Amino acid sequence: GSLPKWNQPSKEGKKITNLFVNNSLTHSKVEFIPQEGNKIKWYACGPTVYDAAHLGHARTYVSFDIIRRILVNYFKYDVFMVINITDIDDKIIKRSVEEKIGFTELARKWEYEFWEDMKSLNVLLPTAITRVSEYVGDIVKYIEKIIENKYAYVSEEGSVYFDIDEFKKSEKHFYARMEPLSVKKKNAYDFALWKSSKPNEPHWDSPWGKGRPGWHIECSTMASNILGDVLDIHSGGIDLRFPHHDNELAQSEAFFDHSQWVNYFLHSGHLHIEGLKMSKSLKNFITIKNMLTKYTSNQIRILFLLNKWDNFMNYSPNGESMVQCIEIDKSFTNFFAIILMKIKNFDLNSCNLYWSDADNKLNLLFRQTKNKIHEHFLDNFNTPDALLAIQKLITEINIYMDKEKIQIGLLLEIKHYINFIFDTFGLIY
Amino acid sequence: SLPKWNQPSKEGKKITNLFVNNSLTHSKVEFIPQEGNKIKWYACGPTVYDAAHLGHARTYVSFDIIRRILVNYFKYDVFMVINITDIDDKIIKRSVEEKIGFTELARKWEYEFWEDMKSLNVLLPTAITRVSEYVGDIVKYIEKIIENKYAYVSEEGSVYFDIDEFKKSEKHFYARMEPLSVKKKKNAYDFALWKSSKPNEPHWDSPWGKGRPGWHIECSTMASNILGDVLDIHSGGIDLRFPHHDNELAQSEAFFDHSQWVNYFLHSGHLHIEGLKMSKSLKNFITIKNMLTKYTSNQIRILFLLNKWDNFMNYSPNGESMVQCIEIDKSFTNFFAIILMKIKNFDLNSCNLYWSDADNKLNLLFRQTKNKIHEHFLDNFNTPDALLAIQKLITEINIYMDKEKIQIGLLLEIKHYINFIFDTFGLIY
């Protein structure tokens, strides 16, 4: 009553790592527990494809790429991931009349460039990609069910609106679970599931007349169709928490008439530039492509590894923030050059392989580093401290390789572990 | 009257529910680390006087696979030691026949052993311990056993392990793994810790006179020095279970005066050829180098993956056993070829990405395969059935790639998972 409740999944029969994640449904770090076995069903909101993507977009998709690699490569969860493409939107329609190429052709062009930018940043494609334009029929059926459950109504003009008041009345439903204080139509807060088509706009048939999906209904529809009635993880940037994500929860609860569609809602922090969110509207943005003419994938990923994913970060342009990233990337490149040369030039015939006190001290540091990094990853994917641990280990390996007689097997094993963590970070050396 | 075994406590340990065939219990028992997720592992190494053969490959490749499963798949932290017996009666005899120094012979065949391991994609251990570099430590180890009253000195300057005295202690049992395999000596079963050397043999100083280590003492000494008083895993071929490994247990228990030096003792089965152990003494052997002039590393590793590590296996020469290995290797090569090209040439601009029933069916089989393979690895490293599970999945992916419009992201994830399992098997495509 008056405050939304959250049900932690039961631990019996689940993979239990003791990972804690910052859950927006609880506004707290809570233990992450799969709904089933070691499986993670994960939906992440995708871009609206009418122009080039920028560094703020990169921060969200790279940060969740890192989290996905930690979940899969490091913890060995089984991740089934869906990302949508909003290729029907007011912005796409308006941009297409300006550009005088079909709306489909414009949306497809900027979707293609989005995925090329993701590939350039070594971001893994999701399991499924759901374009609104390929799901309109399913969206209509989804809305039909919400109406049948009495949680939406049809206006005279042919639009369909979600009935917030009817939804709240139900004891099993709470509206705006994540931002309770942020809250033709019955009430102003009602939001469109189906918009009657304006003249000259692209449109689709429905029982209520020609129209387009509303802003939020595609994500509930697509995630529900592929992933079902319980998502382990839903993600997006913090600006989407309300109204978009809270409205997705209400739509999906209305469709299934249950109380918890998402177990863990994860929200990345914004990249700021000169104190403000990097934003197309503010014209303060740097495109991913322009960033990539000056900096590499590794350097950009290090920029993001240095900042906790769920906190905001400041980007100082003109290379100021990238100085440290370039230095770190260079130290990793040089570390690999040196250790590979030491391994290559090692001669078993002329060496002595006695396990010395220096060998033992490096090994002790090595195993300790593994446990420190494990605790950092369990602590809500703390990559800044994990990256620091790798840097400290590399500093000691460099000292060891310069003076001590080297244990070839130990150096190889350390290199393989650092390779393993770098694969988890998405770095390529 | 029968040896007891203490299962490690589960509190605070990484618990995977892995079961392993433990020679100390003659049964499959749950594997539990002594500390956290750490595995201290000693494996007996070669005697370096001649070339390694396919039977040696079977043992070192099988335990390489187990190590990759433990590390890459389950994420245990393995600290592994392998010794090199570069002082031995066989080395001395061979070196006089060929008229070269004992060290020059041993370094040559140690070098060829590691080259053969690398050719088979076998990972080097953390530490490599040569007897010739540990003689001083062996002397100190023997001094302690004498001080604990479990060894005696003969008039000629040899030191023998005192089986009768060791057994008398209520905390010690002699021959824990093969209880039934049991003039100057007190009892015939007593075995040398230090052998008085003939003036023409290589020898080292000691409190008891010039001599050489006995046959078993080097392994207790080296493992105890580097890994300590409790090993999680000790491994070797089944012929070493007695007397060599049972004697290591007695020596190490006598040194530490405790009851369990090794928690899990793993013994690989022998590779036979025409019904008999592949053996230098029988002159029925195939060198690893000769095998690699006929078959690839992948094909040889598939041969071993097809046979449970702890069971004996028959090798039929003249290509008979390798027919199936070549076919499997060919099917993996052709699968990777197609999936890599389909991923590389996929065009996001022109495709349709609707998640169809065929996509869903392949995804269901994919996740199911992950669970089957997990159960096989937990079942005492059952690679034959995991390999079969991969083959079955590949057959369905090949059908999907031929007919259905392809989900690029699903194919990428399948490719990455199969790569992950092939990394765990040590296959390279």
Ligand SMILES: Nc1ncnc2c1ncn2[C@@H]1O[C@H](COP(=O)(O)O)[C@@H](O)[C@H]1O
């Ligand atoms: N790497 C993995 N692959 C597939 N299933 C897993 C994995 N790790 C844990 N599980 C599942 O997690 C549940 C409990 O994990 P555990 O108690 O660690 O065996 C079982 O249903 C297992 O099948």
Ligand SMILES: Nc1ncnc2c1ncn2[C@@H]1O[C@H](COP(=O)(O)O)[C@@H](O)[C@H]1O
């Ligand atoms: N400046 C930014 N920093 C971090 N994430 C952002 C930024 N701008 C947009 N995003 C996220 O990028 C994703 C796509 O943004 P949009 O295309 O605006 O829907 C959403 O999850 C947004 O929250």
Ligand SMILES: Nc1ncnc2c1ncn2[C@@H]1O[C@H](COP(=O)(O)O)[C@@H](O)[C@H]1O
């Ligand atoms: N991947 C890993 N890396 C380092 N330590 C681990 C790992 N998995 C489990 N552990 C350790 O195992 C003990 C208990 O495991 P758990 O209960 O799974 O956290 C703790 O001391 C953990 O640090």
Ligand SMILES: Nc1ncnc2c1ncn2[C@@H]1O[C@H](COP(=O)(O)O)[C@@H](O)[C@H]1O
């Ligand atoms: N035919 C064989 N099959 C499997 N393992 C063997 C075979 N011959 C020797 N080994 C193992 O290879 C390792 C080194 O053997 P050796 O070089 O004979 O001391 C030991 O663990 C032996 O048990």
Ligand code: NA
């Ligand atoms: Na309510």
Ligand code: NA
């Ligand atoms: Na908002």
Ligand code: NA
């Ligand atoms: Na006894």
Ligand code: NA
């Ligand atoms: Na034996």
Ligand SMILES: [Zn+2]
């Ligand atoms: Zn969305």
Ligand SMILES: [Zn+2]
């Ligand atoms: Zn040994």
